[PDB]
Design an enzyme around this catalytic site. Sequence first.
Site, mmCIF file in Angstrom:
data_model
loop_
_atom_site.group_PDB
_atom_site.id
_atom_site.type_symbol
_atom_site.label_atom_id
_atom_site.label_comp_id
_atom_site.label_asym_id
_atom_site.label_seq_id
_atom_site.Cartn_x
_atom_site.Cartn_y
_atom_site.Cartn_z
ATOM 1 N N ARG A 58 43.617 60.566 -15.623
ATOM 2 C CA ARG A 58 43.115 59.523 -15.814
ATOM 3 C C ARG A 58 43.553 58.874 -17.071
ATOM 4 O O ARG A 58 43.097 59.456 -18.199
ATOM 5 C CB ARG A 58 41.401 59.473 -15.865
ATOM 6 N N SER A 76 39.733 65.094 -24.050
ATOM 7 C CA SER A 76 38.443 64.563 -24.502
ATOM 8 C C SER A 76 37.582 65.473 -23.991
ATOM 9 O O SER A 76 36.459 65.962 -24.633
ATOM 10 C CB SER A 76 38.271 63.404 -23.901
ATOM 11 N N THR A 127 41.542 62.659 -20.646
ATOM 12 C CA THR A 127 42.214 63.572 -20.604
ATOM 13 C C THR A 127 41.692 64.881 -20.858
ATOM 14 O O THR A 127 40.806 64.828 -21.992
ATOM 15 C CB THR A 127 43.489 63.354 -21.583
ATOM 16 N N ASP A 142 44.165 66.514 -15.624
ATOM 17 C CA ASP A 142 43.811 65.365 -15.026
ATOM 18 C C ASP A 142 44.763 64.260 -14.905
ATOM 19 O O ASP A 142 45.659 64.174 -15.420
ATOM 20 C CB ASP A 142 42.446 64.779 -15.525
ATOM 21 N N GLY A 199 46.182 63.408 -26.424
ATOM 22 C CA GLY A 199 46.449 62.962 -27.502
ATOM 23 C C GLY A 199 47.135 61.512 -27.466
ATOM 24 O O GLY A 199 46.649 60.468 -26.875
ATOM 25 N N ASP A 238 32.743 63.569 -18.800
ATOM 26 C CA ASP A 238 33.115 62.805 -19.852
ATOM 27 C C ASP A 238 33.593 61.359 -19.476
ATOM 28 O O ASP A 238 33.852 61.095 -18.283
ATOM 29 C CB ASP A 238 34.665 63.732 -19.930
ATOM 30 N N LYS A 275 51.789 62.445 -14.220
ATOM 31 C CA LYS A 275 51.510 63.585 -14.424
ATOM 32 C C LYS A 275 51.828 64.588 -15.326
ATOM 33 O O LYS A 275 53.109 64.621 -15.674
ATOM 34 C CB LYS A 275 51.926 64.175 -12.621
ATOM 35 N N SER A 315 38.020 61.002 -19.231
ATOM 36 C CA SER A 315 38.672 61.731 -18.234
ATOM 37 C C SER A 315 38.191 61.708 -16.730
ATOM 38 O O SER A 315 37.000 61.525 -16.555
ATOM 39 C CB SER A 315 38.581 63.395 -18.760
#
Lengths: 239, 228, 200, 213, 196, 208, 220, 245, 245
Positions: free
Chosen positions: G19, G129, G1, G17, G47, G166, G33, G169
Amino acid sequence: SYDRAITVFSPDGHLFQVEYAQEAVKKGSTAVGVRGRDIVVLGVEKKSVAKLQDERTVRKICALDDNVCMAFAGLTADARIVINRARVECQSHRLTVEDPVTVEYITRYIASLKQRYTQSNGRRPFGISALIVGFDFDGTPRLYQTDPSGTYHAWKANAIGRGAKSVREFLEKNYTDEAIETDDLTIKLVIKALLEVVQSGGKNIELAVMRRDQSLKILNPEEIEKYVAEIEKEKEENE
Amino acid sequence: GYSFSLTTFSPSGKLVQIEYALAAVAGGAPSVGIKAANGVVLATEKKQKSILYDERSVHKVEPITKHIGLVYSGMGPDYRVLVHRARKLAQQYYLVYQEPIPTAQLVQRVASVMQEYTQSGGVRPFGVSLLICGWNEGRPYLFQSDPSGAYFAWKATAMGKNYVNGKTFLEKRYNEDLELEDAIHTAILTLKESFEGQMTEDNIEVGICNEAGFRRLTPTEVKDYLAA
Amino acid sequence: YNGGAVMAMKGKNCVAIAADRRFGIQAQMVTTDFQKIFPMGDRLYIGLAGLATDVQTVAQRLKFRLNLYELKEGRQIKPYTLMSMVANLLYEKRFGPYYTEPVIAGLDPKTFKPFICSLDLIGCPMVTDDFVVSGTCAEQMYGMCESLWEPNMDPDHLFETISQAMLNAVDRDAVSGMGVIVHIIEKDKITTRTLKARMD
Amino acid sequence: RFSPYVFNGGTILAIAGEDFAIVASDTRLSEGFSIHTRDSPKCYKLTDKTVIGCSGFHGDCLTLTKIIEARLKMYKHSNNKAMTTGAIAAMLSTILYSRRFFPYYVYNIIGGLDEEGKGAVYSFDPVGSYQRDSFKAGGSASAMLQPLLDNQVGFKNMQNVEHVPLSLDRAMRLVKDVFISAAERDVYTGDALRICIVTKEGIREETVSLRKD
Amino acid sequence: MEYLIGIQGPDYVLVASDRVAASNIVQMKDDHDKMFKMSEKILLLCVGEAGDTVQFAEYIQKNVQLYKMRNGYELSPTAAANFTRRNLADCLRSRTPYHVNLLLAGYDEHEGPALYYMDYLAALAKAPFAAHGYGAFLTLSILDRYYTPTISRERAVELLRKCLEELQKRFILNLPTFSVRIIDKNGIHDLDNISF
Amino acid sequence: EPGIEMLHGTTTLAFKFRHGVIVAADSRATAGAYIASQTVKKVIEINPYLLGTMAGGAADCSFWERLLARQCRIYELRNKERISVAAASKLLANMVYQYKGMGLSMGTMICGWDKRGPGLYYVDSEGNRISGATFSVGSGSVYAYGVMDRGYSYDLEVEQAYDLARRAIYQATYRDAYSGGAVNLYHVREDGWIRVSSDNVADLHEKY
Amino acid sequence: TTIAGVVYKDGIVLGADTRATEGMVVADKNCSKIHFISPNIYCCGAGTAADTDMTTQLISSNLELHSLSTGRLPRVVTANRMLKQMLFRYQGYIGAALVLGGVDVTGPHLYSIYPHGSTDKLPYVTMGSGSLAAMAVFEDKFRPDMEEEEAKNLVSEAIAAGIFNDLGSGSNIDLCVISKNKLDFLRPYTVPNKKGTRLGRYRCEKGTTAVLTEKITPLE
Amino acid sequence: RYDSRTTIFSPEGRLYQVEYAMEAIGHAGTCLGILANDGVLLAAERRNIHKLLDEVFFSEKIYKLNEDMACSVAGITSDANVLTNELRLIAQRYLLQYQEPIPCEQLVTALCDIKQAYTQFGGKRPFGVSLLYIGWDKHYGFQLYQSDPSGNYGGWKATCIGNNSAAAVSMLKQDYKEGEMTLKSALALAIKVLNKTMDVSKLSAEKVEIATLTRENGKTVIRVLKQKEVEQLIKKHEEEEAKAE
Amino acid sequence: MSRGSSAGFDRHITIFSPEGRLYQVEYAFKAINQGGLTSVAVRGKDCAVIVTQKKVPDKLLDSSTVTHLFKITENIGCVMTGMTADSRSQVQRARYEAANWKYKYGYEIPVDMLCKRIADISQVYTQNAEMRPLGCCMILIGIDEEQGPQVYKCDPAGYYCGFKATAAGVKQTESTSFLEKKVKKKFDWTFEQTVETAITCLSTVLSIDFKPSEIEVGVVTVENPKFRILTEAEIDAHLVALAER
């Protein structure tokens, strides 16, 4: 007196809720019991015939435990609440003080609850009186009868409800050792007692006995029609 | 006596207190709700006695969701409280269930909440009845909430002053066959029948609920329909 | 801990769902007839995996709450509605987390539209068009689906693919397996089949 | 972190006679390795006939003695009579046990007469299991004190010697000598000595000096 | 620890328990019954942390007796099973020591005998046969190999005896005597304990 | 010790031969390595119907059994008849079941001759409540069990039962470093327990 | 994220994102979403995804009813304070991460809500992230008062850098543009990754697997 | 001597407030249930004279409770709503606790207990509603229970509540049979009953509730009868009194 | 439990009349006019101004400590009419109320919303049994964001509305009549031919020309939005301007 502090002492002291509920059991259906030598009978009428009923649900006779039954008279729903609470307490005793409870102990519990529906403006007094009967721990017959006041006297044999008095002073006029020697005569006294008050014959009088140390046995509409069997005992040997 | 408590029935087992609430509802302002094959319209009278009043600082018909409209006939503040807290109930329902409440379970909510006031003592019954317009899976719903906690679903109904003649007028003038646009006109006709005071633009608040959800009608639109 | 796994994939107006039958106390099987998939409607099922206590708790509590909902609304529940429903039930017991990861497979009561969804253990839906898995052997099971899936699957092929996926996967997990049950929800009828799994 | 308990030290001694019950404690109140004061007695008069001695965590000592005073007044009011020594002991047992899950870090000995006119000493544990005893020492140096008391008062491990009852003068001399002897090996004993002599005609106090090191 | 075992026949359930309690090394009562009488046709086998087992078992005892006396009729073994499962699972989050592993056995006039395995996690599970305790590890294999879904009481008792003999051959603890009862259409039947 | 260890249990004894139950226990509070007392009576005269036993923790045993005494006298008043042994065991077990896992260290045995005859139950801190014919708890309980098991006989005569109790208690205290003091014998005969004697181990050694 | 947002000339352009990463395994290729609550106050978060989501629902509800009571559109600062005080008292507990943006009467606004309740009004924030890389992109290429397409691009590469640099993400790029007048459903704005063609042609054969019991339940 | 606040006795011990509550019952829509050998059928009356009413969905006085029972109501309708919601709640909670459907007797008892408790401590008005219960359990087969605001209750092979209820049962008990009361004959004779106790207005298909309780294939099925069979039965009725002459 | 309501229609608020009219609410309404004071609230496009008497029937009093214009926020103020004590309390209540609003939503409470919340508080009084309605009416002024000034007035009944111009007190009917007359025809009201007209209203309806010691005036302006009160250093100059015409 009027509404507030629902349990108010009378100007002389006649706590109005007490005898007001006392009057509630004179419209209550007449019940009776007899403490015999080795059997206890628990007779009660149902002169609200409504023959399109299920008699199973409208018994007067409930059983408290393995060793106790009872009958009552008055506001039925209140009595049902009493019965459930008493069953719970009996189970708690058999768990904690594990033993079959004596009839006196459960009667005293009942009376304590009944009289503790007198405080606490709140709660109103109960409108029932009970005939607690059962065989003790030793097998002696026992009997206990209470009133909404909270008193929990014991009797040789007593009747409550509609026209209870006439049954009572028939009872001592006939209660004797040569009336309880035989279980058949033991129940026959109750039969005649309500015959004095029944709707003219063995009509919808529900009763059951509890012989020593076996169970509550429902005196049932047998092929002989257990009820009218004893009924015809009196019909054709009361002359 | 036997008519002061809300906690004792009459000697005839007949709640005088609820009946007094009903009479108070009858004394409220006229209101009309018309169901139609493609929507539901709610119309009611603005009684701003003096022109010093502003119509539109406050409002008579209140939205609750995209597709919920409420209107009443009684004493305003009771209606305002009930709207404010039926909003709480519906907002619950969406929080717990990720989909807007269907109108039925809302009127379940509201009926329960007013009825509990009737059966509490020390609290007066909610002296006002409610109307509900809704649109579920795309089909219109119309509910009337009785201050006794009763709730009735109507093809069309009218409450407030002279509502008996209003209902009779509706009886011989409505059909299941109707649509929304003419439903507005016929509801205005119903109010005109028992308006006592010569309709202007600025006496009726109008709300409708279709697929696009409930929404009011601007005073511009009230004039716009009344043109013909 | 106890182990197990669940899975569901969508298809051409047909959804599949499956879960194993092993009930074992952390090393040792207790029996091979443990219930993990539960019917929540005419064409709506939920499959649980995790602590058996939380499985049999969430299932019963969902039965409770959903029955109340059915009687209230008087209508069979929408799949998305149930999804949000269970999304809450795990969340109220936030700091008591029910150790389970439910999955949902169902159709539209008005259109029979394919639908599946899963939840995190405190509730965070993955509304997926293809598949979800849960339990211990999640990764193997993802691996199986990620290749074996295909668009627009007719029900027989859907059943064959779910069968192959779960049988390849649970075979590779120590704590899960020992029997695989499969349900196929189509527009009209329900087929529930049991599979010749390595019973070891 | 925070330690709620601390060891203030101190020693308390009691001996029961026929017409007396000597209670005995010094006044060396310390903490860590520093002498706070030289003159804090550890024996308190409760009633004309009963004297308590407490040792250990001194804060608990104060709280316990004040609540004991309060309960004495309460009993006096409620029953119109001086509370009996045995009643005192039982009350102390229950009140100490009331803190079962947060014990009063205090050792207690009760000096007093019965109501039959004889001496009686009750010993305690920090939780409240008491028992009547002819003699008892509590506190840090009670370990040093007890065997000698056993040897003389109890005549334990003696042979061929008359078991004469312990007279008042002999008891006084014995308690003085035993604290003098204790002062030179224990670190928490000395700087003073408080002695309470409970008799049938009231309570008189006695005090001497010990090693002030 | 202890050891419990249940075997369900075509029309009956057979249970067996060891009869020794421990403190550290000692066996204070050699004649101890760990098995309770829920009602006329329902038997409960309990084991787990000392103290909790008896308390929870008798709690269920009072509940089920109260149910029977409130209703007159008899609670089904499946119903009591689920009831115990709930009364055990709820207390999991608010009673840290509550270890009770259970084997609830009984007969129902409708669905025949039913035996229920019950881990202290309150994870109820039907079983044609099951067992708790350490000895279950050594014995469940034997119970599996010589089991058929249909077994008359005689073969059931003999298989159980084989199980117990295997314990006495291999298990490190000392379990000399076991209580055995069987439940069928005619209430429960006491069977002579297995002495050695 | 921050004031709370109170015991770990020393050498109790009880069995129920055909002339009532006899119980036996020593008297040696073991404050860690230092003896608190030599004269701690461990048999507790709950009433002239029923006897307790102190073991495992002094204060907890004493307090909870005294509370039991209150409760049972209340029972005897309300029901007008004496409480049974089993009922007293139930009361103690229920009372001590709460405060589970809070440091309680009780090891009592309830002994009495009620309407069912002899009554003997083991009630402890963690909730065990079991009857039986033979018991002993404490550190020296193992040695006591040895000698007892080799002495016990339901038909044993009364005086020989006394000898058995004395021998068992003496051997157990002889091996245990933590059991000691003077031995106490209490016989619970027909209604009303009877104190037997309180003899000293030192003299017993001469007698043995 | 990896979520980020900026305040361009006439609104906010949120980025996110899709993922979802259950552990080191992709939970969702197209994660639920990240755009959210009622108009002109869209926010995105990260989080403990569950609590982000359900907190957003709670505040959405509590604020929507507030607005309905008002009859006026809600304000960003209102939601800001609500999120403050709720992500507060449950301090030392789960909480969440949030980027709150919207355009009320006072124009655009953008606060960055933190788990314990740390918030702050910024022209640009990045959370998740890959927040580090996204912030790098911003600090490299952010100039005040970007145009709408310029801001959209800037966020596009901001999210892309997090995607490609990352581990937790990377998926479809999501854009969320809120202006004083308009609002866009850019769901998703641009996807850099396409699943490779399946060279296998398995086409699961019928009768592949033996079946023990076949139970059929006709319904209709 | 004086009556108020649902907790005070008159000098005869019977509660005035509950007896008043059993007066709107005498004004509520007539509702009756019949116990058949192999089913249960239940009738009631609509007060829905207004043609502007709609949305007759699924019931208008027949509230469905558990997997297999439903109830019927007469009295204060919102009071009824609360009572039915509560009934469903405890029914489902019993199932949760036991994984078995609630036996009818247990549910009726648990409800009338609350009803009685409101005739107790407190002071708020009691429920002005009398309830009928139709359902099945494995213990006892088809059962039919009446409820009373006092908390009294009973099993009936046939009973009626509402206006004219005394007359209705008066004819019923001279009409009902011991156990050849098949579902269709019971329907026909129930329709004859409702015809005779119904007020002056001619009987219509648009004023009756007929809902039935039946079993097939291990499942308990409750239907609310559609209209078409309602005219079928009522025109059948008018022609079999075309016998009656 | 509590002493309870006295049995009677007008005896207590909770009981409805036969037409369900709340008597105690009317009693509160015609309890407002105690104290004799009558207040007037009018607003223009730039300012909202509220004016009332300052009855000082004692010069042991201090003119400063006696007042009816109580600042609630630096932006929002109010006026009181009715008994003094309940006005005390509601001023406290609304100050707290708006402060909580700002704390919990981060922006200054709108005038209409504060009025609504106060109306809710007043309404809930008419629900309970030992509540007594706060017999005082409270009027607001302020500038929200765009709507310029607003004037709002709740009441013991809980009814409120937005007023282009309003009044409350003894001569309320006459004040409303003069207000209607003025508002229908002349309606610019910038700042001086503005609310000064309401001062003319108050003088004409009440008495002869006033000299400012009896008058208490507070204002809020669109270009300068503080709740702020003019003095005899100010009000005097206004009223000499008004006296000349």
